[PDB]
Design a protein around this ligand. Structure first.
Ligand SMILES: [Mg+2]
Ligand SMILES: [Mg+2]
Lengths: 48, 48, 48
RNA sequence: GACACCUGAUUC
DNA sequence: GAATCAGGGTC
């Protein structure tokens, strides 16, 4: 799966929940979502 | 299949997306809302 | 659907619904309650 | 079920 | 500020 963080410490797409969570855990109002394709993860990122 | 029943909020009723329901219950005192899988169940919550 | 343990409240004990638990702790000074997976854990909290 | 976070109620 | 509960991305 591809982890999209559109809002967090460090935005971008990540390949693991482990790295994804470092950006969003304890970060107020973090916006993230996992996807099956890189293309979708990136679309999410760019929607802000 | 996402139905958000707003029993207590800016506007009461059933909504199809969380963003919609959120705008009626966020920062609203004693807001009462719940998400259901079927429109029917959402109305019950709203009319009870 | 868990077990609501009320250590301090109008009536203490273990309740099965938030409503019943709520009726005992809401606006009760110094109310102490928590939900547990089992009844045993719950009655454990009631006696501390 | 758990974790994080948002909002609300109550209590301290 | 904190806790408990209620309603609403990830594991
Ligand atoms: Mg990565
Ligand atoms: Mg709508």
């Amino acid at each position: 799966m591809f982890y999209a963080v559109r809002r967090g410490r460090k935005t971008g797409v990540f390949l693991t929940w482990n790295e994804c969570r470092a950006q969003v855990d304890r970060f107020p109002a973090a916006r993230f979502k996992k996807f099956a394709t890189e293309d979708e993860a990136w679309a999410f990122v760019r929607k802000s």
